[PDB]
Amino acid sequence: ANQASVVANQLIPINTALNLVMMRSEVVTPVGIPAEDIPRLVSMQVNRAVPLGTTLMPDMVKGYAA
Numbered sequence: 001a002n003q004a005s006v007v008a009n010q011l012i013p014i015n016t017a018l019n020l021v022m023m024r025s026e027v028v029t030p031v032g033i034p035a036e037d038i039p040r041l042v043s044m045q046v047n048r049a050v051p052l053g054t055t056l057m058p059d060m061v062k063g064y065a066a
Contacts, residue, residue, distance in 0.1 A: 002027055004026060005028050005032035006033045007024050007025065012046050013049055014047070015045055015046070017044070018041050023041065023056070032055035037066060046060050046062070
């Protein structure tokens with residue numbers, strides 16, 4: 001209950017480096033990467049294009065290990 005995840009604030013293009021305009025948090029189901037990891041996700045790249053409103057999942061960010 002109430003775990004907030006990272007949600008795509010806009011379409012995050014393939015292989016693009018993440019920035020703070022790109023990520024917002026929301027309570028979504030299923031639970032994805034925790035909202036508190038938005039600082040650490042900055043500059044990491046996605047390996048697939050992430051459509052607007054998609055929850056960001058661990059398998060989508062290159063070099064992500066929590």
